[PDB]
Design a protein around this ligand. Structure first.
Ligand SMILES: Nc1ncnc2c1ncn2[C@@H]1O[C@H](COP(=O)(O)OP(=O)(O)OC[C@H]2O[C@H](O)[C@H](O)[C@@H]2O)[C@@H](O)[C@H]1O
Length: 507
């Protein structure tokens, strides 16, 4: 009664069900920022190339340490030198850190509020904790940030719209980049009226420091736990970020594949109970959502407990309808309680995930953004349903991997919270997309036992009647036509699942 359907023990998991990884190597579609010949378990990766190479152009990250990162001083000065002078001062009071960050962000000295930072340091932390923050954690964060040019020696390409491309970098490289984001050093990522990066998420952390939300101290404690850990002892693994764009989507009405298997449960979570499975991130199209600002639901929580996810925001352009982002190897650094306005940092987490042959933790997460529905009936429009199917399919599909090497998809109430979707429709949409990609589904209803029973009952009804993906999608089209298209009322007369049962049983 806590779970229904296929036992979870019968589902596929990594590393055990994967194909042997090819040799890690750079190519036209795979950027690798470390020495693959020198990659060894338990050893910090050596950057490749050995010495910094800079690109300052429209296809790459604009690094803070670039010699083309200038500031009008009536003449040009080196912003990297300015950052060095600003950050290498000792901090004893939160005003010190604010003044430091603003030295190289002068145009934002009246726009960026630091109230949350000041309050965290002065009004949440005990004296000993504040002292540890400014005597140890912050100066260590400064040093790894300022080592950037020795750590990230290779230009990082932007994962731009329509690119099918991967970047594999070390956890150490990510820590240095994230310390930079914390100190707000990334240029051209700040103007509200910016052109080049308007289609990219926020990366600099300035909005984490604003206002008086009671959740800011919990975000900051979660992030400082990470920074403490990665500056005290350099992490040794790698992380891969892959942008995936599909060209041909299924003719859904015509799909003759059968449904796959389902485990559905009202207990557990994606991140704890989906080990070795493709874990779904219920994303915003600007990946990470409000992680560095006010957001604190499913995506922001995952980005906080696995902060290596946050660096996706540096190089991942806003997802189009046919796109996703697949992140392999992020490490869990914190545990938490609650959710949204009750979210709290609990303690440091020791990740026991095994690493694959590329020294990546065996944790695969896919960012797929649902549509945000403002009116209930909107989501039943065929175009919108087909959009959600194609999005999930893109997230689930692994071109040229066979089904027996695909783990189950660990998912849940995608789009049915901040984004207003109907869980029962979305559940069926995910089940169809999983079918077409030939993966099983492990579905966590996050405490809703009725929804568990309902998803289970519908799935077994459809499976026992041998209804194909196409048969089911056609029933969704019928529901729209009979109950939604000509409905002038906000909510239809008959619900989806009852409609389906009656339509199938009536034929
Ligand atoms: N750990 C979890 N495991 C399983 N299910 C979960 C978990 N956490 C939450 N749920 C369930 O999943 C439901 C939906 O989680 P939501 O986070 O609202 O995702 P959306 O797709 O609707 O909104 C995405 C936007 O919100 C963010 O800001 C993004 O950046 C986007 O801007 C919850 O109501 C729970 O029932």
């Amino acid at each position: 009664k806590k779970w229904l359907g296929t036992p979870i023990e019968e589902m596929r998991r990594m590393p055990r069900c994967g194909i042997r990884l090819p040799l890690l190597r750079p190519s036209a579609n795979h950027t690798v920022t470390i020495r693959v010949d020198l990659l060894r378990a338990g050893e910090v990766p050596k950057p490749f190339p050995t010495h910094y190479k800079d690109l300052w152009d429209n296809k790459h990250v604009k690094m803070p340490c670039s010699e083309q990162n200038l500031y009008p001083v009536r003449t040009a000065g080196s912003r990297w030198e300015l950052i060095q002078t600003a950050l290498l001062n000792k901090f004893t009071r939160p005003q010190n850190l604010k003044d430091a960050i603003l030295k190289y962000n002068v145009a934002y000295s009246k726009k960026w509020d630091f109230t949350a930072l000041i309050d965290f340091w002065d009004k949440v932390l005990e004296e000993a904790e504040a002292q540890h923050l400014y005597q140890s954690i912050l100066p260590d964060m400064v040093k790894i940030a300022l080592c950037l040019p020795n750590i990230c020696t290779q230009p990082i390409p932007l994962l731009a719209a329509a690119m099918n491309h991967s970047i594999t970098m070390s956890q150490e490289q990510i820590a240095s980049l994230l310390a930079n984001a914390f100190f707000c050093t990334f240029p051209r990522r700040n103007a509200k009226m910016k052109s080049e990066y308007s289609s990219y998420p926020d990366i600099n952390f300035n909005r984490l420091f604003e206002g008086r939300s009671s959740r800011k101290p919990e975000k900051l404690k979660t992030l400082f736990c990470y920074f403490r850990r990665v500056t005290a002892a350099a992490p040794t693994g790698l992380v891969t970020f892959t942008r995936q764009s599909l060209e041909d989507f299924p003719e859904w009405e015509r799909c003759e594949k059968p449904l796959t298997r389902l485990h559905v449960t009202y207990e557990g979570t994606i991140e704890e109970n989906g080990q070795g499975m493709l874990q779904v991130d219920f994303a915003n199209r600007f990946v990470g959502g409000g992680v560095t600002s006010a957001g604190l639901v499913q995506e922001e929580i995952r980005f906080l407990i696995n902060p290596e996810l946050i660096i996706s925001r540096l190089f991942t352009e806003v997802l189009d309808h046919n796109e996703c982002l697949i992140i392999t190897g992020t490490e869990q650094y914190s545990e938490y309680t609650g959710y949204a306005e009750t979210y709290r940092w609990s303690r440091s987490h020791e990740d026991g995930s095994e690493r694959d042959d590329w020294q990546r933790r065996c944790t695969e997460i896919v960012a797929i953004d649902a549509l945000h529905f403002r009116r209930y009936l909107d989501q039943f429009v065929p175009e919108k349903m087909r959009r959600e199917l194609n999005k999930a399919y893109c997230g689930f599909l692994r071109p040229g991997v066979s089904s027996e090497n695909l783990s189950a998809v660990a998912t849940g109430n995608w789009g049915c919270g901040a984004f207003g979707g109907d869980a029962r429709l979305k559940a069926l949409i995910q089940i169809l997309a999983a079918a077409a990609a030939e993966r099983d589904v492990v579905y966590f209803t996050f405490g809703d036992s009725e929804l568990m029973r309902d998803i289970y009952s519908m799935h077994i009804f459809l499976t026992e009647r041998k209804l194909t993906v196409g048969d089911v999608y056609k029933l969704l089209l019928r529901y729209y036509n009979e109950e939604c298209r000509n409905c002038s009322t906000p909510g239809p007369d008959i619900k989806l699942y009852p409609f389906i049962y009656h339509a199938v049983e009536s034929c």
